[PDB]
Amino acid sequence: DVNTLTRFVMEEGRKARGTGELTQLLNSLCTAVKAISSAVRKAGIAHLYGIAGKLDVLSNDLVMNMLKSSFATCVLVSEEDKHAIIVEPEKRGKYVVCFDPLDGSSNIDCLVSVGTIFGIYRKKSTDEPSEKDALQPGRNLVAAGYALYGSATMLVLAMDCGVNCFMLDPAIGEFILVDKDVKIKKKGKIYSLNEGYAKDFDPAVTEYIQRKKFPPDNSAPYGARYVGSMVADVHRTLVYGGIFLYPANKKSPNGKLRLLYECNPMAYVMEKAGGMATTGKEAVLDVIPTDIHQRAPVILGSPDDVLEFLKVYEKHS
Amino acid sequence: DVNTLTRFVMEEGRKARGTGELTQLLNSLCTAVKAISSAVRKAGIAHLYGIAGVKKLDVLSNDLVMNMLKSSFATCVLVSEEDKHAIIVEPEKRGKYVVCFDPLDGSSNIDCLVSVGTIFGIYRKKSTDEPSEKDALQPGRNLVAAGYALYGSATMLVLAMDCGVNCFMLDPAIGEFILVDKDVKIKKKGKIYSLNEGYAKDFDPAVTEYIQRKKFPPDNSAPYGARYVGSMVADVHRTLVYGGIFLYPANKKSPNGKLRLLYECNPMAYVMEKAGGMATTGKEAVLDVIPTDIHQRAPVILGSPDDVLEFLKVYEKHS
Amino acid sequence: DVNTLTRFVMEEGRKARGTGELTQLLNSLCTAVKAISSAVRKAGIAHLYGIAGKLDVLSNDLVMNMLKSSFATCVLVSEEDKHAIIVEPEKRGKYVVCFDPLDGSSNIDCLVSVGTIFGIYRKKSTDEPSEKDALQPGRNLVAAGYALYGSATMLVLAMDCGVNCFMLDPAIGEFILVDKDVKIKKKGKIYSLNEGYAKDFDPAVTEYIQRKKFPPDNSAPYGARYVGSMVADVHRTLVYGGIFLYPANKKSPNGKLRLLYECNPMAYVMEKAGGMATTGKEAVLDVIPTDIHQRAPVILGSPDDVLEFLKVYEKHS
Amino acid sequence: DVNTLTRFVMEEGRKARGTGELTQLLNSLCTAVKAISSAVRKAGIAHLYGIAGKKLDVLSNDLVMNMLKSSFATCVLVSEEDKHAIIVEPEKRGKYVVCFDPLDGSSNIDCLVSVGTIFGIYRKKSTDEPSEKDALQPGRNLVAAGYALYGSATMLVLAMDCGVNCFMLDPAIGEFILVDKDVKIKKKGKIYSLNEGYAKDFDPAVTEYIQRKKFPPDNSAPYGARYVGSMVADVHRTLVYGGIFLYPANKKSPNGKLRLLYECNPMAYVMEKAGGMATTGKEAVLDVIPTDIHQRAPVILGSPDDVLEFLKVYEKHS
Numbered sequence A, C: 001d002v003n004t005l006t007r008f009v010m011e012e013g014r015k016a017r018g019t020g021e022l023t024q025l026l027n028s029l030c031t032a033v034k035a036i037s038s039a040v041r042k043a044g045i046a047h048l049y050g051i052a053g054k055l056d057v058l059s060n061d062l063v064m065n066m067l068k069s070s071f072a073t074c075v076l077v078s079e080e081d082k083h084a085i086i087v088e089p090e091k092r093g094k095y096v097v098c099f100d101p102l103d104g105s106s107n108i109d110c111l112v113s114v115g116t117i118f119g120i121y122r123k124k125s126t127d128e129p130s131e132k133d134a135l136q137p138g139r140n141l142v143a144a145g146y147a148l149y150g151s152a153t154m155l156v157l158a159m160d161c162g163v164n165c166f167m168l169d170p171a172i173g174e175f176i177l178v179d180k181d182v183k184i185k186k187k188g189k190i191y192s193l194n195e196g197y198a199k200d201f202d203p204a205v206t207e208y209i210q211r212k213k214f215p216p217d218n219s220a221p222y223g224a225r226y227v228g229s230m231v232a233d234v235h236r237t238l239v240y241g242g243i244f245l246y247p248a249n250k251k252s253p254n255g256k257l258r259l260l261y262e263c264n265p266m267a268y269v270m271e272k273a274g275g276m277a278t279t280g281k282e283a284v285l286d287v288i289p290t291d292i293h294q295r296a297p298v299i300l301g302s303p304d305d306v307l308e309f310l311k312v313y314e315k316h317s
Numbered sequence B: 001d002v003n004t005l006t007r008f009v010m011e012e013g014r015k016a017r018g019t020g021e022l023t024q025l026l027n028s029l030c031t032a033v034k035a036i037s038s039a040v041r042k043a044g045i046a047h048l049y050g051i052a053g054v055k056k057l058d059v060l061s062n063d064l065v066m067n068m069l070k071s072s073f074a075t076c077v078l079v080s081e082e083d084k085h086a087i088i089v090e091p092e093k094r095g096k097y098v099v100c101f102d103p104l105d106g107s108s109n110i111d112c113l114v115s116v117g118t119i120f121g122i123y124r125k126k127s128t129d130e131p132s133e134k135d136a137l138q139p140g141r142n143l144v145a146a147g148y149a150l151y152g153s154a155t156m157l158v159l160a161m162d163c164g165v166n167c168f169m170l171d172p173a174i175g176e177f178i179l180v181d182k183d184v185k186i187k188k189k190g191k192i193y194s195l196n197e198g199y200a201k202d203f204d205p206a207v208t209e210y211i212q213r214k215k216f217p218p219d220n221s222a223p224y225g226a227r228y229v230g231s232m233v234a235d236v237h238r239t240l241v242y243g244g245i246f247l248y249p250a251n252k253k254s255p256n257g258k259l260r261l262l263y264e265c266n267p268m269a270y271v272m273e274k275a276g277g278m279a280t281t282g283k284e285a286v287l288d289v290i291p292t293d294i295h296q297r298a299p300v301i302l303g304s305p306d307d308v309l310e311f312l313k314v315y316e317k318h319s
Numbered sequence D: 001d002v003n004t005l006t007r008f009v010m011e012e013g014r015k016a017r018g019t020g021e022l023t024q025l026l027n028s029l030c031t032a033v034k035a036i037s038s039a040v041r042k043a044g045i046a047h048l049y050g051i052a053g054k055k056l057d058v059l060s061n062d063l064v065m066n067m068l069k070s071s072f073a074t075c076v077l078v079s080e081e082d083k084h085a086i087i088v089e090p091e092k093r094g095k096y097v098v099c100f101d102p103l104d105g106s107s108n109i110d111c112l113v114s115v116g117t118i119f120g121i122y123r124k125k126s127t128d129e130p131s132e133k134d135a136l137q138p139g140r141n142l143v144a145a146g147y148a149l150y151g152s153a154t155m156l157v158l159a160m161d162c163g164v165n166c167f168m169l170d171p172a173i174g175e176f177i178l179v180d181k182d183v184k185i186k187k188k189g190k191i192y193s194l195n196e197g198y199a200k201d202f203d204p205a206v207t208e209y210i211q212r213k214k215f216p217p218d219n220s221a222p223y224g225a226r227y228v229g230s231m232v233a234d235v236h237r238t239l240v241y242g243g244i245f246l247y248p249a250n251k252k253s254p255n256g257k258l259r260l261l262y263e264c265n266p267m268a269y270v271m272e273k274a275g276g277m278a279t280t281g282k283e284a285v286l287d288v289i290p291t292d293i294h295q296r297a298p299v300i301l302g303s304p305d306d307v308l309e310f311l312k313v314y315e316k317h318s
């Protein structure tokens, strides 16, 4: 039978015997995501061009607003927002959400694939909600995923039950389940990183990419792909296998990607899909953050590829 | 004044004082591109998944372009990536134009939701002979129109003609391509290079040297960023929008590159050249290559004039 | 805050402390309505006309499948099916649904407004599901309403909490709650029936309609409207007050419209809006169905108007 | 083979060897109409209900006005929404005068009644400076007219010298697809359409005519009655199924209710091209010579046999 995100989430919820907040949260995110998709695909653009005589900002407003009205959240961290937003007590629910409302957007003018990234934490404590409630390691995630506004719009949702992929059908505004309990290839054949930073790379990354173009075991060299938009690169990685890297560079000594709402959700998705995600020194999900916008290196993808990077990392110490 | 594709085209058609054929042609193509975009974004996918109790997107895309063009009464010969031979339009539906197209470029990887696209180049039939495959064998120098539709975060049709390059955004609420970027030009020099670095061991020594100049500047300048969607239309469009260079060169294993001359390299070269950019195979202008096979491959380095220049300088250092 | 159908039903469910099966049912039918809306508006028609080289039935198929796959129904009665449809054991739920998938499609060739009507019963016996589970008075309805495919598409949902109207936003595929706990006017100024067949009218119908045209006192004669499509006629009556008649006469002593999936849902909606709905002889909701496709007369709308009708009806009885 | 309004229009223009001014206008109307549809079906209504934290007739008028101005094909625009004729600025002047109802039936849209956009297009006839007088042409002078019905689906019906063609809007691709070619109305229908709530006000001709529908003197089947109360809807049904549509004069509306310029003339034009009729009772709607842009006319229109029957009755009563 056809399954939808709405149906899927209510069924899982009923099995966990949960009260419904997470469902209401995920339903509201789904609303926000459909509306961001609408805007990204430029529906209504003629009206801007005068037929009857910002997108990152709107994206933030959509998610911020649908999350508040959900009655499920209490602390909301966005890449757009300097500090955590503390939800008003009347609208307060139990979950903390870290999101990137429109990832890839700084290059939206070339119509590059963009996406929304979210990671959901339950707030355990009896304290009044504070920004510090967002400072959890990714291991604590209850749900995470992303919507990709590529050629088509897909929501990938990860929870304990694994990874599940939902295609937006724009004809009916329905997220349709199209890839159940997804698992990433053990080993892939594409590597993904901005090689313009070659000059800046640590020797571990240098040697690893060197292996990719010039295989030690006489296998075929890996192909290379770097959209430059993380959701697009992480999705392809999930879909076709392989490895994605944003290692530290000169201008980014702790990486450029932000831990809470870029790294953690993609590391969670990956792990739930039987892939891996490391900073090199430890797993992304094990990093305990001290700043809500802290940056992290990230090497993620197919388990064999990632263990081969760390193999090399571990050689250089 | 809001401007759309149909309006722009019609006014150009009138400026030129044409009979209307190229306009019907582009009109048909515009409709095919709308239906492609619809299909690509997965409208109706719910039905494939059993909501009420099938052709692959590249096949559909080809069928939409083929049919619309035949029915525009503006074409006589059609070359499509999908068809080994050129399609000779039936006499009753015959017009003066030859269209070569790639109906859904980058679709081989569509499973990951990569940007994909439709590329076209339009020629006048120049023989008096009955129409044949040979009419499609013109250098891109002879192009009347060309461009692409990109189905990315949004859908955009980029159309290059004598008057220059113009970008139309698809508003899916109404199904109009609205004019959003007029008489586009490329930066003289960019800061991004774009090619599959994974096949580096197969690199031509000129290509190795240039990519080394980009990553490891010899003059204190800042290294270029790398970007490679692996989907031509996405990378070329980024090239057009942000500047820089796109490479699919010939190596040793592929003396003629990989990308197809007629319906891939030519239209993009034409778009680039119309926007004050450059496109070379290494040996000459893409648009100068006189083709001998409709499905023949070509190397292509394209983008900013300064960046391409530099590639050519390095290429000539290796001869 | 912005309210949607899914959110509204989930919060009603949680307030009722239900197990969520009605919510599942409703969300499933919602999905079917969005998809019927898409087909009614002719999305995809270009393909049928060969760009690249049934409606009532498609609507029926959409409703049935979404309902069966909800895990919420056991018996389904459609205008389109000769017999009740018994849901397969593995997907059986507690509810029985009566519906008219595409009401008034008889004339869809003129692009007249169309509609889907539904009424939802809880199954009352533990007996093996049969046609008998559907033979309940409309009084026993848990929920009922309609989807109007008009200038816009709206879902009107009646339950014990009252009547709430939701606007389908096609940009995102969300029913937006635009009218809350709606109530009908006390007295209307519109009468709605098929006057072409005046010669077959009951003496009482004749007199009543004469009174609307030629009022005894110094009042304005009512307007007339008759769409010929029940959902459209009943919605207008809802919004503008007044009276809609599809009455019994000598040749049709039980009327023409069907009790289970036309009259009962509409009478339930009317009653929850403070309206009225009689067969002339009794309230439509009080009629005990003996056959699933049985006919009933219906006079419904603003309470004064309906009571005025009964006065004339009683005059002639 | 698939034909679309844009394709159909161009081919008709090249066939008549026109310069393309009527095509630019008709393309501009087509766009505005898809824009009207999208608003009418309530795309984006969630933003007005505060998802991220104009009146439809007003916006509908603005989309026609701006699209027609920007066509460069028009000089005088008459709209239901505007008391005075709009005179197109000189730099954008073309040769056509367009009278339109940007959102007919809108005043009841609150109940999601079928609404529509109605239009008639005249060539500016006088050589005078563009003014309101340019809109005061008899319906017979129409060059093209029709409507866009926003019902269960959106349809544009376009009537010209080559006849009447109907195009379904496909919302997936924003394209008007030709679905009914060279449309003709049935010789005689079995439906009559009018607001009988004015029965007390009817002149005896209208009273008798309707009586004959209900209690047929040859004892044939009574006509059915339909009345949406939205002109486009009621007239589209009359074209599709045949029969008759009446909105006669009444005490509230002594010169009729429906507007001559942008309700009666466009629909009368469509009817005649489809081989039906349209009369005010005394004369053909298209023969009425207007004196005022918002002037009203009684109207009886539809299948020829049925209008011919109304007129024999009208003549029986003088």
Ligand SMILES: CNC(=O)Nc1cc(OC)cc(NC(=O)NS(=O)(=O)c2cc(C)c(CCOC)s2)n1
Pocket: A008, A009, A010, A011, A012, A013, A014, A016, A017, A018, A019, A020, A021, A022, A023, A024, A142, A143, A159, A160, A161, C013, C018, C019, C020, C021, C023, C024
């Ligand atoms: C007692 N409940 C009952 O009888 N019926 C009923 C109906 C219903 O919808 C109608 C929803 C729910 N509960 C619900 O949603 N709980 S939840 O905490 O939000 C949740 C969602 C997911 C998806 C989880 C999976 C957790 O994986 C990490 S946990 N219950």
Ligand SMILES: CNC(=O)Nc1cc(OC)cc(NC(=O)NS(=O)(=O)c2cc(C)c(CCOC)s2)n1
Pocket: B008, B009, B010, B012, B013, B014, B016, B017, B018, B019, B020, B021, B022, B023, B024, B144, B161, B162, B163, D010, D013, D018, D019, D020, D021, D023, D024
């Ligand atoms: C005699 N024609 C006349 O009086 N009016 C009129 C109306 C009309 O639309 C109503 C269209 C046209 N002509 C037309 O379309 N010509 S065309 O060859 O197809 C063309 C398209 C483009 C875009 C060109 C520019 C090429 O730039 C290098 S040339 N003419």
Ligand SMILES: CNC(=O)Nc1cc(OC)cc(NC(=O)NS(=O)(=O)c2cc(C)c(CCOC)s2)n1
Pocket: A013, A018, A019, A020, A021, A023, A024, C009, C010, C011, C012, C013, C014, C016, C017, C018, C019, C020, C021, C022, C023, C024, C159, C160, C161
């Ligand atoms: C115990 N439940 C719990 O802990 N969480 C939770 C979450 C939830 O959504 C997440 C939904 C629900 N329950 C629910 O839907 N029940 S229901 O029978 O389907 C229903 C729908 C309507 C609309 C009714 C009103 C009927 O009027 C009498 S009753 N429960």
Ligand SMILES: CNC(=O)Nc1cc(OC)cc(NC(=O)NS(=O)(=O)c2cc(C)c(CCOC)s2)n1
Pocket: B013, B018, B019, B020, B021, B023, B024, D009, D010, D011, D012, D013, D014, D016, D017, D018, D019, D020, D021, D022, D023, D024, D143, D144, D160, D161, D162
């Ligand atoms: C000389 N023209 C030529 O060689 N090519 C060419 C191309 C073209 O578009 C590509 C349009 C046109 N002409 C055109 O549009 N004329 S028009 O006055 O606007 C018109 C529209 C309709 C529909 C009419 C029929 C009127 O019947 C009542 S007349 N011509």
